[PDB]
């Protein structure tokens, strides 16, 4: 496993999001978010994205990364403050 620290994993997620931004402003978002990736490990998602051959799947992973990153920031906020 990558055995990367929480901050390290977050940094990688941001880099992937920046590399391939996904606005999802189009209807393409619908039918894609239904995919369950929150249960996929960080390493699994990384491999999935690299091996991803579908744009829909790529967007799904990007969405999971954004949501995961958001939660991470919120968690840190609680420990850092309040």
């Amino acid at each position: 496993r990558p055995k990367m620290t929480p901050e390290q994993m977050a940094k990688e997620m941001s880099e992937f999001l920046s590399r391939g931004p996904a606005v999802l402003a189009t209807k393409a978002a619908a039918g894609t978010k239904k995919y369950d990736l929150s249960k996929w490990k960080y390493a699994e998602l990384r491999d999935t994205i690299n091996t991803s051959c579908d744009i829909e799947l790529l967007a799904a992973c990007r969405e999971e990364f954004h949501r995961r990153l958001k939660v991470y920031h919120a968690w840190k906020s609680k420990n850092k403050k309040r």
Partner: peptide
């Protein structure tokens, strides 16, 4: 404890 929670957030997709 806390570290484990962060790991889950960026691994298991847990809320923390």
């Amino acid at each position: 404890i806390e570290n484990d929670e962060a790991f889950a957030i960026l691994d298991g997709g847990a809320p923390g």
